[PDB]
Subunit: 119 residues, 4 copies
């Protein structure tokens, strides 16, 4: 039983920047692109045997009982980046482990995946 928690890297900084510069068009662009990119993530996960647990904009969490190629899955997630917006991931054997692994990725960089047992 494997869990994956996926979240955008510092998307809040890009949103705040758009508010402070009065950039309506950039804010609407981010809104639309976050919605479209998290749909691509969820459908890819579904096509690879996952069950979607949580799906907001910039955040998707899922689980599977099948074996998966995490390199392939995270390569797909990396290919869904747009502009200076990327996503990180944590993998674990329950929700808490995937969440802590996700914090590990976020605290050590961007556009990376961590597996809890390997920390």
């Amino acid at each position: 039983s494997m869990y994956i928690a996926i979240d955008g890297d510092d998307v809040g900084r890009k949103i705040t920047s758009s508010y402070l510069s009065n950039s309506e068009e950039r804010l609407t662009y981010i809104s639309n692109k976050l919605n479209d990119t998290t749909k691509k993530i969820s459908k890819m996960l579904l096509s690879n045997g996952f069950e979607i647990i949580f799906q907001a904009a910039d955040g998707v969490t899922a689980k599977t009982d099948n074996e998966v190629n995490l390199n392939f899955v995270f390569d797909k997630i990396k290919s869904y980046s747009f502009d200076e917006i990327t996503f990180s991931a944590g993998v674990g054997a329950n929700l808490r482990e995937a969440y802590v692994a996700l914090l590990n990725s976020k605290s050590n960089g961007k556009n990376m995946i961590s597996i809890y047992k390997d920390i």
Copy 2:
């Protein structure tokens, strides 16, 4: 012209709590209610002549040139609370003011609305 920025209060803490307690049911519940609540927010704003600028996760930002009763709009916002999750808002004459007024609401309480001009 008037801009309004709306966001949930402490939603991230409820989500974090769900991960650390291994509560899939509560996490999925939060996901569904957030998405349903922000759909209700966007539809109420569009119904009062707003153009939606941003709609993602727990935030909705919009603008209008129509006349607007803010008491009506924010009483509607307050009716969309669920469990321990409330929503705050900031209003201004541009996006920057609405954002700063939202930060004012978040920093001074829960379930409240701030007009940028009243903060000066």
Copy 3:
């Protein structure tokens, strides 16, 4: 071997409020009360046999190999609350457990302590 991580609750919110209201005196009061209270916590942990690992801003992290009464230690921490500013704590057998327990406290309330093995 026991680790404890202590951090203020929502202190950033009180600070942001003071900036946005141009409340110079309020901000300076928070600065002083924060540094004074964290020194109080640090001296208290030393008096109960801890070694300080980290002490900065609104947080103190310490470890001990000696015997401890946790109820006495955290009741002391709660007695260091001022105005609406309080502190939460996490305890574990290593730094990661103490941190995750601290995150558990912060996400479920304020002025509370979590022991990692209890979660």
Copy 4:
């Protein structure tokens, strides 16, 4: 009167990394380095005729009514960087302007300074 708000960039991420990797030495190193650096920042501001309003770790805010070379002041701030930790700044005519300028710096880059009037 000029207000300046200074804050470290990404300090919390370096701290979190240390907890999660069980690196006591790296966490104590950060603690010691942050405390050294905030004292250097505040002593430099005092040396330039500022009055300190707020001083925590990775964060110092001050104000002055005298003349100041901000370029010299921020050049000193940038020289206090250590490892991957840099500092950002906002300048304004009151606390709220300095804060919003600092938010502008942190959302738009690393190791930068913003003057509130330059953002309008």
